[PDB]
Design a protein around this ligand. Sequence first.
Ligand SMILES: C[C@H]1O[C@@H](n2cnc3c(N)ncnc32)[C@H](O)[C@@H]1O
Ligand code: SF4
Lengths: 444, 123, 158
Amino acid sequence: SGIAVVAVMCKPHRCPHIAYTGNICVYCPGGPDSDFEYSTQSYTGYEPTSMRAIRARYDPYEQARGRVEQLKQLGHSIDKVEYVLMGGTFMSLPKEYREDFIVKLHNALSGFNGNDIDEAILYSQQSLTKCVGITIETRPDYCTQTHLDDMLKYGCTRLEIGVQSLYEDVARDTNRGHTVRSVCETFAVSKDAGYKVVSHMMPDLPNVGMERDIEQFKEYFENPDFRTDGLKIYPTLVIRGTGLYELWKTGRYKSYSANALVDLVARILALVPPWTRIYRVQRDIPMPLVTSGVDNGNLRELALARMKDLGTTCRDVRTREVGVQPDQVELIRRDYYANGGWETFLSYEDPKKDILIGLLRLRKASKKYTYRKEFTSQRTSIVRELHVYGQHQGFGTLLMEEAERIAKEEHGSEKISVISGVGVRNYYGKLGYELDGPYMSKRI
Amino acid sequence: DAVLNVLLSNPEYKKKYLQTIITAYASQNPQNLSAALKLISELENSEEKDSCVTYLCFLQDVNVVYKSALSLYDVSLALLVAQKSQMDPREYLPFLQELQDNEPLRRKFLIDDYLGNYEKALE
Amino acid sequence: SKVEEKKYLLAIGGTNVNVFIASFILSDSGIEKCRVVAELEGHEDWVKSLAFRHQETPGDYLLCSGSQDRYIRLWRIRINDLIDDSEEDSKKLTLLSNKQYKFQIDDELRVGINFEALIMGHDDWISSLQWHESRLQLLAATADTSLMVWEPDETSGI
Ligand SMILES: C[C@H]1O[C@@H](n2cnc3c(N)ncnc32)[C@H](O)[C@@H]1O
Ligand code: SF4
């Protein structure tokens, strides 16, 4: 089996930082103020997801339903689907459009027909084709206390922030619109609300040279400010109508050769700690559109082969699973400090074959943060995801048995709380948990 | 055998731990399914024939259980096994109906031609 | 719908794989003895539409139960003194799927609900269900812009 990934795009709109800056990001292609016909921001219209959107005319009930039943004409036999939103700055849209968007995302699985956001998720809880999560990408200045609890009502569990640089000059000179000391503060309120925080990083930006790229990513996992649970490596591509195309035209910006770039990402993956995953090493842009930058579309395996003859194994949690039988497994945990709280990473491992079975995240709720009403009347601890691959069945109930014993004793908590998605709310109701708002919690 | 040596002696051990007796037989190399499916037929109190056969058909293929439930000559037990077997109900249910109305000794010849117990059929 | 003087039957459906049927007796002021008495299994997904057929034969009529597993399972409700008695020592190997539900409303009106037919197809979820005023057809509307009439043909039964 597995998890079905259905990607939808919202209405093509303008970012909200075009007003007070004067324009959008230097490297961003596409959008309404471009030459691509009827394309969402940061897209070209020639992508296999972005071609299903234009034929659907961005109708969320008809875009998602055509994608779901397409994947079962191939015969994947889907019953657990995780939505992901992309394109634009979805939380910058008007409030009466965003809530009606998410409602028809749920109606394509349940069959309920209505417009109340507070009632559509209740019908979606007893659905049989169920939603395990919704990924919504946004900007770091749109994760305030007003926006983070709107995502809890929508059913969102994972959110993605474009960081793309850890230097102050790069976020200024590329007209990014925020500061790097501001994104390290909104990571803290997001992880204490219970979200899986994934960030985006971009090598080969302007004015960041070859050597500055490797101390950029060494800092990203040594500093306890960031230490997130995921990355999407997006190397810089020069596109036709972008802002950096004129820098390529007048000879004031040149890119990497495709022997030093694959050497770079063979060193970046060497520093990846075992609690984070690398979703993408490059993005799906058809190479006839791109002028300079990445030549081919096979940078993933060319990076794994380049670290074969360096002796270094990429210990990535996207790489280290069954995809070879364990025959045995141990229980280990890892403890790191991330941006205000004590994160732990429980997993079942084999140190010989280097393969993972299950994993879990858990966080002590800090005191400088955590504005939520349910997490203030007493000292609580937040479990953030459970993710078991595939007897080989009781790995879920073992990770919940251990995360609860470690919360009463070592955290000293009176309540444990889950950020389970709507379709998987019934798996926790059997284990003694009860719903209180967005969370599925229990007094210890 | 040693597990079955203790909890087949007391009357109260086969009350609480009646479900692990089903695994204790059905985990052997002789595969003693005929003694597991014998003590199910004596369960007269409630619907626990349903809750035990749905556990015996998980750790074994169902038509392997169906042919063994058919062999101990009680036809009402073989009906409950066949409904769990994703078979077409137009095939086995007419075959089970012809076996019901005959005489008992008439049945024990008809039941053995199906399975391959030709000498046991001939007796 | 109604049965014969004041006794009604209501058919609840939604959000699970089963069909709920209740009953209540009328009175001069309101109703009483309102309770759930049946629990109809057989489906695989939610039940989107269900409707009663008019009582053509006195004491015998049908029941359509459309659902979200693309199936349009039917039922059949009979009356007092026509119950199709079963479970006798000369039993018929009853095939427990056709287990012939049975209850009483108060004491003097008891019914029997069994399974009748089962239809595949429809290629997608079905929306709305309609019977006919006189004949024995059935209209079904689906979610893939289709609309088809179902009819029991002769010499086959199905
Ligand atoms: C919306 C996502 O798209 C990525 N993104 C934006 N522009 C480019 C480009 N030229 N090349 C690669 N990735 C890009 C951003 O880093 C953001 O994470
Ligand atoms: S990068 Fe993100 S924000 Fe900057 S323009 Fe492209 S999409 Fe809008």
